[PDB]
Amino acid sequence: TSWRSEATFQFTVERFSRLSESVLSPPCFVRNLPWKIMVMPRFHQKSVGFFLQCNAESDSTSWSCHAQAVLKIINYRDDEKSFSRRISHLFFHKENDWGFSNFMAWSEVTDPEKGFIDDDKVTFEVFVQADAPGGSR
């Protein structure tokens, strides 16, 4: 099941408005690699840093995964309004994570009227598709 080429997994960050540091989600396996969502506030204009991390703990320096993904902050009210952005990147030991330091504006995601924050909880979602070595077929 960890050999799959794609997957969609979520990560909820509680007490979000108080977040003053980086938090990391448990791994989700795709192409036998552990993928994670990394979140953190970035700096008077504050923004949400949202990144996709792949196999960062590995000592190995010969692994690589070409992947495209949809980094999305879910909107509890109107899904049509779920905020998402796409990435494409070659993950490997020197660049094991990719995303947006200015994914979205802190004031907007933490606005109780915008639909992204509920009971101070914000949910992140990532749909990732990764390649893998194989024959030409």
Numbering used by the authors: 63 to 105, 111 to 204
Publication text:
Herpesvirus-associated ubiquitin-specific protease (HAUSP, also known as USP7), a deubiquitylating enzyme of the ubiquitin-specific processing protease family, specifically deubiquitylates both p53 and MDM2, hence playing an important yet enigmatic role in the p53–MDM2 pathway. Here we demonstrate that both p53 and MDM2 specifically recognize the N-terminal tumor necrosis factor–receptor associated factor (TRAF)–like domain of HAUSP in a mutually exclusive manner. The crystal structures of the HAUSP TRAF-like domain in complex with p53 and MDM2 peptides, determined at 2.3-Å and 1.7-Å resolutions, respectively, reveal that the MDM2 peptide recognizes the same surface groove in HAUSP as that recognized by p53 but mediates more extensive interactions. Structure-based sequence alignment of the three HAUSP-binding peptides revealed a conserved four-residue binding motif with the consensus sequence of (Ø/E)-G-(Ø/G)-S, where Ø denotes a non-polar residue.
To facilitate formation of a stable p53–HAUSP complex, we generated a chimeric protein with the C-terminus of the HAUSP TRAF-like domain (residues 53–199) fused to ten amino acids corresponding to p53 residues 359–368. We reasoned that such design would ensure a 1:1 stoichiometry between HAUSP and the p53 peptide. The structure of the HAUSP TRAF-like domain bound to p53 (residues 359–368) was determined at 2.3-Å resolution by molecular replacement. Binding by the p53 peptide does not induce any significant conformational changes in HAUSP as shown by the structural comparison of the free and p53-bound TRAF-like domain. For example, Pro359 and Ser362 in the p53 peptide anchor its interaction with the HAUSP TRAF-like domain; missense mutation of Pro359 or Ser362 in p53 abolished its binding to HAUSP. Mutation of Trp165 and Phe167 in HAUSP, both involved in the hydrophobic pocket that accommodates Pro359 of p53, resulted in a complete loss of binding to p53 (unpublished data). Similarly, mutation of Asp164, which forms hydrogen bonds with S362 of p53, also significantly weakened the ability of HAUSP to bind to p53 (unpublished data). Two non-polar residues, Pro359 in p53 and Ala226 in MDM2, are positioned at the same site upon binding to HAUSP and make similar van der Waals contacts with a hydrophobic-surface pocket near the edge of β-sandwich in HAUSP. The residues following Pro359 in p53 and Ala226 in MDM2 are both glycines, which are very well superimposed and make conserved main-chain hydrogen bonds to Gly166 in the β7 strand of HAUSP. P3, a hydrophobic residue in MDM2 and EBNA1, stacks against a small hydrophobic-surface patch on HAUSP. This residue is Gly in p53, resulting in a loss of van der Waals interaction at the P3 position and consequently contributing to a relatively low binding affinity.
